[PDB]
Design an enzyme around this catalytic site. Structure first.
Site, mmCIF file in Angstrom:
data_model
loop_
_atom_site.group_PDB
_atom_site.id
_atom_site.type_symbol
_atom_site.label_atom_id
_atom_site.label_comp_id
_atom_site.label_asym_id
_atom_site.label_seq_id
_atom_site.Cartn_x
_atom_site.Cartn_y
_atom_site.Cartn_z
ATOM 1 N N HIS C 39 0.818 -1.208 0.000
ATOM 2 C CA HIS C 39 0.000 0.000 0.000
ATOM 3 C C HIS C 39 0.853 1.260 0.000
ATOM 4 O O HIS C 39 0.485 2.255 -0.635
ATOM 5 C CB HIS C 39 -0.939 -0.001 1.204
ATOM 6 C CG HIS C 39 -0.340 0.603 2.435
ATOM 7 N ND1 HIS C 39 0.447 -0.116 3.308
ATOM 8 C CD2 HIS C 39 -0.405 1.859 2.935
ATOM 9 C CE1 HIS C 39 0.839 0.670 4.294
ATOM 10 N NE2 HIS C 39 0.334 1.875 4.092
ATOM 11 N N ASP C 61 -1.739 -7.200 0.190
ATOM 12 C CA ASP C 61 -1.103 -5.918 0.496
ATOM 13 C C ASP C 61 0.383 -6.091 0.797
ATOM 14 O O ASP C 61 0.895 -5.609 1.808
ATOM 15 C CB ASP C 61 -1.815 -5.210 1.647
ATOM 16 C CG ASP C 61 -1.473 -3.741 1.720
ATOM 17 O OD1 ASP C 61 -0.807 -3.241 0.793
ATOM 18 O OD2 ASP C 61 -1.875 -3.083 2.700
ATOM 19 N N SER C 113 4.728 1.236 8.956
ATOM 20 C CA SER C 113 4.383 -0.046 8.363
ATOM 21 C C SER C 113 5.624 -0.697 7.771
ATOM 22 O O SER C 113 6.450 -0.035 7.135
ATOM 23 C CB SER C 113 3.313 0.132 7.288
ATOM 24 O OG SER C 113 2.119 0.664 7.836
#
Lengths: 52, 161, 161
Positions: C39, C61, C113
């Site tokens: 993402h 993802d 992330s």
């Protein structure tokens, strides 16, 4: 008109009673934090498409 | 220690139900489902829990709903194992023997439906519905869990509190 | 000790991702392959890695790449087992209970992330992707591993970091 009205009664009653059968078969699984058993989900569709 | 843990867990996981200005029962947060005894009539004393969609199962005598996200952290964690012995409860101890939950004292009163039964680890095992007075003891008509199946066990002569 | 080895393995298996002059994520090298959050967008801070062909997967993802052999010696160790309990993280400890990862602190922010989560022995278990504000906590949407398959867990209301 009479035959048509009886046909509509038949189709509505049958479809409604399938929906009732669906809810009764699937009701215990909505009361536990458990899985939906995709074997049951594929044959018997439900409101949760992917979640739970 | 165990009583303290039970007390804070209950306070963070129990809300009273209001009907006609009187309490009718309690609603508990376990795992990811809010439970309420179906026979108990009223409304949960919480605005967020008031508007939720509740799915009812009369053959199980239970209404279940899905918690809003901002409260999922305030829920107890559950288990499916019921070893023989004794367990904790808001009114002391309960005896699980031979598939029967028994109140040694018979101290339950109507309107206490919906109070969780705790494990020795503080985990929730069952939610009481009522009691049956056999002699000096009170067997518990209660809702419990299998691996994935909800089962409502009910002795003869049980009364819906 | 455990925190120190976690930190140095992070030093040897974390690379910064830049975009428009600001940090966006991190790519971590596990086993024999580099893995990145799909993402997030940006470029890896390495000429060898930036030229690799990233196999893309939006339903997981994730983005993957096969490493050059000369970083094979700088590879973290993987596992598929997720025993119940606690695990390490760059910002403290994470709790694995009931099939979900939670952050006790609730200090999650966008841009982290791709930070690996470690096991007790320094093995990597999963990779942080996003977080959901679970009141005083944050529940993690994370990519984890089965015996031979990849899975992604996304709690309701989680937003990608």
């Amino acid at each position: 008109v009479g035959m048509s009205l009886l046909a509509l009664i038949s189709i509505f009653a049958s479809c409604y009673m399938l929906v009732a059968a669906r809810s009764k078969c699937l009701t215990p699984y909505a009361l536990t934090p458990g899985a939906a058993v995709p074997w049951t989900l594929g044959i018997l569709c439900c409101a949760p498409r992917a979640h739970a | 220690k165990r009583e303290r843990m039970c007390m804070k867990i209950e306070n963070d996981c129990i809300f009273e139900v209001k009907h006609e200005g009187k309490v009718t029962g309690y609603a508990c947060l376990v795992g990811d489902k809010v439970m309420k005894p179906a026979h108990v009539k009223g409304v949960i004393d919480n605005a967020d829990l008031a508007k939720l969609a509740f799915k009812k199962s009369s053959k199980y005598d239970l209404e279940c709903a899905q918690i809003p996200v901002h409260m999922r952290s305030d829920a107890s964690k559950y288990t499916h194992e019921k070893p023989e012995g004794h367990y904790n409860w808001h009114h002391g101890a309960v005896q699980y023997s031979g598939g029967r939950f028994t109140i040694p004292t018979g101290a339950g009163k109507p309107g206490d439906s919906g109070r969780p039964i705790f494990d020795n680890k503080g985990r929730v095992v069952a939610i009481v519905l009522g009691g049956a007075n056999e002699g000096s003891r009170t067997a518990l008509s209660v809702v419990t869990w299998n691996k994935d199946m909800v089962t409502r066990v009910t002795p003869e002569g049980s009364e819906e509190w």
